[PDB]
Amino acid sequence: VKKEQGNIRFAVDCSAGKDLELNLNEFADYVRTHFKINNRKHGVAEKVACSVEGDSLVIQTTGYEFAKRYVKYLTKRFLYQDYQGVFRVLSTDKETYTLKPYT
Amino acid sequence: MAKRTKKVGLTGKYGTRYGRAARKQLLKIETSQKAKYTCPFCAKDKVRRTACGIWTCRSCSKTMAGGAYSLHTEPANAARATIRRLRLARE
Amino acid sequence: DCRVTCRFHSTYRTRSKIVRYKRTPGNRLTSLRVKKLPNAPHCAETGKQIHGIPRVIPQHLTRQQRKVSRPYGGKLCGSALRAHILESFLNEENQA
Amino acid sequence: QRVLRRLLSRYRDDEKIDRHLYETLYAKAKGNMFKNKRVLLEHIVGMQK
Amino acid sequence: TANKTLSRKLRLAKKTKTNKNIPRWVIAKDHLKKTWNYKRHHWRRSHLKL
Amino acid sequence: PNTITEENLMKMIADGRGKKLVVKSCSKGRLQGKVKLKLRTAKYLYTLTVPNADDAKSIVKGCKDKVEVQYV
RNA sequence: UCCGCGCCCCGGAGGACUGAGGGGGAGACGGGUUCCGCGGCGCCUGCAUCUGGCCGCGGGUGACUCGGGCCUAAGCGGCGGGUGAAGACCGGGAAGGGGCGUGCCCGCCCGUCGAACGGGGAGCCGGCGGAGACUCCGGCAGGCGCGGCCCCCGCGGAGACGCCCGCCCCCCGGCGACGCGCACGGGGACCGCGGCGGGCGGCGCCCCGGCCCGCGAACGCCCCGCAGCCCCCGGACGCCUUGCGCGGAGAGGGGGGCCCGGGGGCGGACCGCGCGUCCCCGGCCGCCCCUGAAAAGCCGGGGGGCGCCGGCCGCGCGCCGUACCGACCGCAGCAGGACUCCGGGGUCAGCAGCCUCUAGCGCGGGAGCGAACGCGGCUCAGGGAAGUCGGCAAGCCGGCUCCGUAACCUCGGGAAAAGGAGUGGCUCUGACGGCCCGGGUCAGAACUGGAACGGACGCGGGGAUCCCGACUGUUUACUAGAAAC
């Protein structure tokens, strides 16, 4: 199935509540611009699309399988741009990650 | 082939050490001990020397007494014949 | 580290002191002694392993498993007992 | 040796090579005659043709 | 030593219980003036059974 | 421990031979929902995995009541 | 080193070090409580101390399975007696027991000596304490005895053998039970590489590229298990190894069996993949004027004699050892000497050197100054042994590949002779398997760099002779390692 892959959905619940800001639409641009299939970002938007559903952000694919670690890397990078102090990107069930605020 | 030109064939191991006379005698004595003599009963040349005085057929599995570096020593072979001729005479 | 230390009373590694290593449910390397195989009965005549007898201590082997089903079953092998039966019939016939 | 023998045993079992030819090729390979399986494969095509 | 003998252990044990100071009340009762046992041993220097 | 020879030996052992208890484990590990019946006996703990929840219902009622069933 | 209240003790933060033949974790021995917890410093801790192996107090070593015990090994004792002034030494020729039964048999003749490394009946996983654990506690298993109760004296296959298992004597065997090696194969652990799930860290720039974690025991069944051995049909130049080996005394081929310290499934209770490393195991081959313990116990087989044997259920398993050791032994807290067991990563041919993960840890004290002189370490223009008793000491050489190798010779050697050339990084291109999937070694190029590459480390200088001793060996512990033995 290394060739077949499939359609998969990974999501991050921001849970900031806008208490700590978090644009979310801008968050989806960060994931959308820096998502790379291989080392190359060429033709990423055909196999993968990212969209903001309410508080959470959803990364869905049509023919691609990627590590839920990647959503953890992309998120972490987006937070290093601005809100470095908060968010622990803990898992909250398969498919879903939560941007849990820090202690 | 012809890795060793002279009789150093089994004596290559001893190297420069030990002198030519020693090695020359060993070349005859060790060649015979290593060689496969014929089995009197098996009828195959698979007899090999298990130990000094002991030669074992690798086919029959029979173990036979013999000389130290040769299955049949010449003095024993003469006595074998002498005993047979003397027994048949005493018969 | 995966160094396992020693299991036996004394560290000396004699024939009876060989130890295999396996992991445990608790994620630790465990020393399990490799008991020496006690061999199997060997044919008195021929000196070959008698078939049918597992290589374990006969004490724990059970009677049926430690006994071949043939006359002279543990002492002599199938081809060896043929030889004895043949020699006895022919030799007895010669006297007759 | 194993590679040459495996190609020679599989061809003996596919009756491509007769038993007498198999022995000659097997001994030739014990004697270093064929370096690669490609070299043996050609000597095999030449042998049977 | 971890493989000791009960008979050896018993003699070594007496030495451990015997290596004790004069009870203070004993010093007082007999008016000792010499409060040091002098038969007290130490594992670092003294070699018992030597 | 040993796996029991399924229900055929299980019922006979529970009915006649000494069985201390029937630890009944349901869907342990969540790999499958099949119930597992573990029965401690003087010689060994015998374990049978009944494929269905209703199969598990059958053994607990259909046995000598001297064996005690504790669930998991 | 800084800070905490801070002592050299402790805690955090740094910076190191021992560097898996450990300054690590454990045992045998030897010491004999040093172990642990709490309090203290009067001693001791060779400076200090709030520290401690020191001092006071109170505690701490749990076993059917591990070891002793057990059995034998070298050996040592013992023996009617023999001898000697004896003490003592020496020792088969001497009416030397056992079983059931109350009678009859069987029978020359000692070790309940000697090994906490040899033989041996059988134990694992988790958890718990300040001090312990194959011992405790919870699980689960095995061994051997014992009692109760039940059951009852062979079948199958053509064979190899398979299964639903009788004991005791006399005899025949077996197991215990065994050298060394070079390769080679097979498992286990270790290791690495990916994937994926879960945590982290750093982030000026990059980063799906860094790190950590992801577990599965004994013992039950059931099935596979190379090589090896055997059975059946049948009648051959075939079958095969890395090396071999093998076959009319029966090969190949087609079936079968057996053994295999193993592997799988089910119980007990993450998924792939790869090269290495270690340990065992297998089949051979080699080697010896070298042929590589014994016994207790256990178990067959024949003959007899005579009835067993199982299952389930209970029950039992006694004596000893078990803390700790940077603590032993040398007068010391003595750059002194102490035997094992387990052994990660990178560079590498490496278990080498050199750094590191884990784990340990900061050692009879500190500050300054930067004299002479010492002690170790570097460098030195031009010359180069002219120095010296002597090239002592230092320096040269060295890894790998590829050329090129002389006299001489007991034809094996000399030989790495001598004497040279290459070596880095990047970017490619060929080789080599299995059935699109793996190996990372060997070639061949370009291109680039102050005219550089075994860039540290590791690591022969070479030649020509002469005398002794053929050689490898051995030697005056502690002034001779030799031409001596």
Gap sites in chain C (C to N > 2.5 Å), preceding residue numbers: none
As to burial, measured by CB atoms within 10 angstroms (0-12 exposed, 13-18 middle, 19+ buried), residue C89 is exposed
Cβ(A14)–Cβ(A99) under 8 Å?
yes
Signed CA dihedral, F24, F28, F33, F36: sign only: negative
Of D42, D35, D49, residue with least CA distance to D4: D35
CA-wise closest residue to B59 among B48, B71, B72, B73: B48
Q: Which helix (H) or strand (E) holds F9?
A: helix F6-15
Q: What are chain E's partners, defined as 3 or more CB pairs within 8 angstroms? A: none
Shortest CA–C1' contact from E9: which nucleotide?
Answer: G32
User: Token digits for C79?
Assistant: 């081809």
**Structural tokens at position B13:** 């191991």
CA-CA distance, A41 to A44, in Å (whole number)? Answer: 6
Measured distance CA(A56)–CA(A17) in Å, rounded: 10
**Nearest-CA neighbor of E42 among E7, E10, E9, E16?**
E16
The backbone torsions φ and ψ at residue A85, rounded to the nearest 5 degrees and listed phi first, read: -65, -40
Write out which nucleotides of chain G lie closer than 7 A to a protein Cβ.
Answer: 20, 22, 24-34, 54-57, 60, 66-67, 116-127, 134, 139-144, 154-157, 159-167, 172-178, 188-191, 195-203, 207-209, 214-221, 228-231, 237-249, 257-262, 266-269, 279-282, 285-291, 298-302, 309, 312-314, 320-325, 327-329, 332-333, 340-344, 357-359, 410-413, 431-435, 470-471
**CA–C1' nearest nucleotide, residue D1:** G242
Residues with Cβ within 8 Å of F13's Cβ and at least 6 positions away in sequence, in order, are F4, F19, F39, F41, F46
Cβ pair D34, D6 in contact under 8 A: no
Please report, rounded to whole angstroms, the spatial distance between the CA atom of protein residue A38 and the C1' atom of nucleotide G455.
Answer: 38
Residue D30 is classified by DSSP as: H
Q: Looking at chain A, list the stretches that DSSP marks H as alpha helix, in order from N- to C-terminal side.
A: 25-34, 44-47, 68-81
Q: How far apart are the first and last CA of chain A?
A: 41
- Residues C72 and C70: their CA atoms lie apart, in Å, by 6
Contact between F22 and F69 (Cβ < 8 Å)? yes
Is-contact C41 C16, C-beta < 8 A? no
- Helix ranges, chain F (H): 6-15, 53-61
